[PDB]
Specification:
signal, binds guanosine-2'-monophosphate, globular, 1 helix, alpha+beta, disulfide bond, binds calcium ion, about 15% helix
């Protein structure tokens, strides 16, 4: 079974931890990868009910299981905060234009 389902993509907790650790390390070193500069602040325009505190940062999580290194980011993202806590897993899949919806 999937811990998080983003559209057709199935993710386990380990996938999220792996993705988060990569994004968080870049954040701490003050570096970004990709033309969209990940990781970067997530403003929560959608108004999701994140239990943990801000600031939030979005980092792409890939369906292939590979850690993002600069190419196409895809539709899925892990959102983490300043204390290295997972705020949530979101996706552009099933959402209008550039909006996000939560992964179930
Ligand atoms: N939908 C959405 N985009 C955000 C948010 N915070 C920052 N962004 C950025 O605002 C712009 C319009 O969505 C994009 O550059 C998007 O970045 P990404 O495309 O890198 O996710 C947010 O809370 N929601
Ligand atoms: Ca996996
Ligand atoms: Ca692989």
């Amino acid at each position: 079974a999937c811990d998080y389902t983003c559209g057709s993509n199935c993710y386990s907790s380990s996938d999220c931890s792996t993705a988060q650790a990569a994004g968080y390390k870049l954040h701490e070193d003050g570096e970004t990868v990709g033309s969209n500069s990940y990781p970067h602040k997530y403003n929560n325009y959608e108004g999701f009910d994140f239990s943990v505190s801000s600031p939030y940062y979005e980092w792409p999580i890939l369906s292939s299981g590979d850690v993002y290194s600069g190419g196409s980011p895809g539709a899925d993202r892990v959102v983490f905060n300043e204390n290295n806590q997972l705020a949530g897993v979101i996706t552009h899949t099933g959402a209008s234009g550039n909006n996000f919806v939560e992964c179930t």
